[PDB]
């Protein structure tokens, strides 16, 4: 019969690993605040990806050295029987940077370990990086053959380039709350880019900041989907 190769092969024995780095408490000398509500995010992600049949590994309060070593070790594993790879980063951040408990780590350093040439058992497979962290300090006021080494990566950023990312101390972050809700409802129905578009809408319409500080009050947020994927991604098969 006629065959179409438009979607990633997601019927390998395992869906893959879902590494969640949950950084809540930071070393006093860094001057970084405690990320209240991040445990709600980590727990929501653990349950969401468990139901998607991913082998979830939750890591709490890792130093910059521990983050690099974890990523290196995970990239050196045999992922031949795995369909994909997911890494969720929950921490403080700047543009292109994620914070370890004792200091910064370049996002490029983390993602480079999974390049098509550096992690052979993941070549041609989707590598998803979900990042809940700030990408700067701007506030949104609102209104109304061979394959590339950078191919097959998807970066689901919580916020637009140069902007702050919002996290609620009780409910968790706007992005992760929305991501988990949309994956629970649409993972058995829609393609990943379409699920992420629903997350963009949810964060954009359902949330607005409340603060006694006028500078941080009534602010909005829009996530940023960055795709270097070459095929469509469906969490289901058959």
């Amino acid at each position: 019969g006629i065959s179409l190769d438009n979607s990633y092969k997601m019927d390998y024995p395992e869906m893959g690993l879902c590494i969640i780095i949950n950084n809540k408490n930071f070393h006093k000398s860094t001057g970084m605040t405690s990320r209240s509500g991040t445990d709600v995010d980590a727990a929501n992600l653990r349950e969401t990806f468990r139901n998607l049949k991913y082998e979830v590994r939750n890591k709490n309060d890792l130093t910059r050295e521990e983050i690099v070593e974890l990523m290196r070790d995970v990239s050196k594993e045999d992922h031949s029987k795995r369909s994909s790879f997911v890494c969720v980063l929950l921490s403080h951040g700047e543009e292109g940077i994620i914070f370890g408990t004792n200091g910064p780590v370049d996002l490029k350093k983390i993602t480079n370990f999974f390049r098509g040439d550096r992690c052979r058992s993941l070549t041609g497979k989707p590598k998803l990086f979900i990042i809940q962290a700030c990408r700067g300090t701007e506030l949104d006021c609102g209104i109304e053959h061979k394959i590339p080494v950078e191919a097959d990566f998807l970066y689901a950023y919580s916020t637009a380039p140069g902007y702050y990312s919002w996290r609620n101390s009780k409910d968790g972050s706007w992005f992760i709350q929305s991501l988990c809700a949309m994956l629970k409802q649409y993972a058995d129905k829609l393609e990943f880019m379409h699920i992420l578009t629903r997350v963009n809408r949810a964060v954009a319409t359902e949330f607005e900041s409340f603060s006694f500080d006028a500078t941080f009050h009534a602010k909005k947020q829009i996530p940023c989907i960055v795709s270097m994927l070459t095929k469509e991604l469906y969490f289901y098969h058959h």
Binding site: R35, S91, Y164, W166, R167, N168, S169, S173
Partner: peptide
């Protein structure tokens, strides 16, 4: 609400 807090920022990261």
């Amino acid at each position: 609400d807090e920022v990261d």
